[PDB]
């Protein structure tokens, strides 16, 4: 498992009439565990996260412990083919590209 | 409990004498579902994709979580005179990713 | 006339796999709401040669022979589709 990082997750898009390019739709996901002290490869934590971790270490019990989540995204473009018609679309914020727990 | 939103969480600083005393740092808490019943901005495409995967029948290893998305700085003063400024301390928005 | 043949070629090239286990899930695309004409011909010839390098040969021959119209979007979209197929076919 290891610490918080990025990992693969892909699906296949299918249509009954048209054909889509590209077929394999790729959208990674963030997964792992981040602890204290930090043993990771991403940038340093913020002040909020270290405050929460210290609170957890003193003996308290929070109702929402820190979670590993992404912090950036990139767009994508799709093309659809069918008789007498080709179409293209551009959709932003689809592919995750970084992870860091908040 | 309700849906994902912001809620109070404060501590007291004690060491000199510090101003201000009550250190305020809110926290995000709640649950976000499908369809959206919230007051924050609309979800992204990634989150709706994950929710649709979860609804179809699959079982993800990291379901969406309610987290903050903004921060503000703060300034502290210590008397015995010193001042410090530290950024990214107070959460001010919530939205699940 | 021409696009339909390209659709047939694309469908023909996507052969089924032989692996014994499901690779991933399939989900329909219902969600996620939003003057050099020589370039296209050269790109088509290059892609045809690359595919030649390696059933589908008659369709490619028909495409090349078919080779009138001035819609700005169609040429650009076909160029982009061929550019994508260039990477896709190498798999």
């Amino acid at each position, epitope marked *: *498992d290891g610490p918080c990082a990025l990992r693969e*997750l892909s699906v296949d898009l299918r249509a009954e009439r048209s054909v889509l390019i590209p077929e394999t739709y790729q959208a990674n996901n963030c997964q792992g565990v981040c602890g204290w002290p930090q043993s990771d490869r991403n940038p340093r934590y913020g002040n909020h996260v270290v405050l929460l971790l210290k609170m957890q270490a003193r003996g308290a019990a929070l109702a929402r412990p820190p979670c590993c989540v992404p912090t950036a995204y990139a767009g994508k473009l799709l093309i659809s083919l069918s008789e007498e018609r080709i179409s293209a679309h551009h959709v932003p914020n689809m592919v995750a590209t970084e992870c860091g727990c908040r | 409990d309700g849906p994902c939103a912001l809620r109070e969480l404060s501590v007291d600083l004690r060491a000199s004498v510090l101003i201000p005393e009550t250190y305020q740092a809110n926290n995000c808490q709640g649950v976000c579902g499908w369809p959206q019943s919230d007051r924050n901005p609309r979800y992204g495409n990634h989150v709706v994709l994950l929710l649709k*995967m979860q609804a179809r029948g699959a*079982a993800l290893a990291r379901p969406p979580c309610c987290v903050p998305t903004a921060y503000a700085g703060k300034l502290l003063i210590s008397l015995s005179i010193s001042a410090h400024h530290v950024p990214n301390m107070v959460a001010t928005e919530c939205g699940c990713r | 006339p021409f696009l339909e043949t390209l659709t047939r070629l694309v469908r023909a090239l996507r052969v089924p796999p032989a692996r*014994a*286990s499901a690779p991933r*899930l399939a989900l329909d695309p219902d969600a996620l709401a939003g003057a050099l004409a020589r370039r296209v011909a050269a790109e088509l010839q290059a892609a045809a040669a690359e595919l030649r390098s390696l059933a589908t040969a008659p369709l490619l021959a028909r495409l090349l022979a078919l080779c009138g119209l001035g819609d700005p979007l169609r040429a650009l979209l076909l160029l982009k589709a061929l550019q994508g197929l260039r990477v896709e076919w190498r798999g």
Partner: antibody
Amino acid sequence: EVQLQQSGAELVKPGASVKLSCTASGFNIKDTYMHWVKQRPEQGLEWIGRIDPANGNTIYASKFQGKATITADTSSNTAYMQLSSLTSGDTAVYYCALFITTATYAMDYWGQGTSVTVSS
Amino acid sequence: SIVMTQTPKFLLVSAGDRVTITCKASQSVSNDVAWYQQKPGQSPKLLIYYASNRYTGVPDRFTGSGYGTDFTFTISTVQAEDLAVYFCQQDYSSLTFGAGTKLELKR
């Protein structure tokens, strides 16, 4: 939700053929393949074959080749398996399954089991 | 074809002990292995997938690890509701379902 429903127990003469069925519910079979599994009381589990409804390309193991035919029909979300040339060694329990495993998600659904007995 | 060997073939606990099982492979199987559970008169149910993750609803007690050619499955604190038979499956080729291990309690 998803539910897999099967037929009932069957008793057959030594030399006839059988046709078992497996029908889904609350799901579309075209999304992924369907696997057929066998179980004997003491020899453990085994694998017979799988079918892909969208295309119709089926795969069988190296031991059951030539005596088990799998077919699918998406008009009503059903799959059939025909078993031929029984020899009183096939008395067992058969299962209908969906499997998917990936680094970030997985699915696993099983049927209820159909019992086949061969005697005179 | 890949052949999977599972040990031990029998086990016995006292309702408070730790248990460990091993499932070795005959050839490099990357990290494609799954661990199941079958109670009497019921169909199996997945417990662990892709070597080390955990399906929805599985408690914390169960765990698994390994890689390459050796995989292990451990339960920390056995309880009275854990009488079943455990299998190890691989997926790098035509699926194979191990051999199976039983379990028993004391009193």
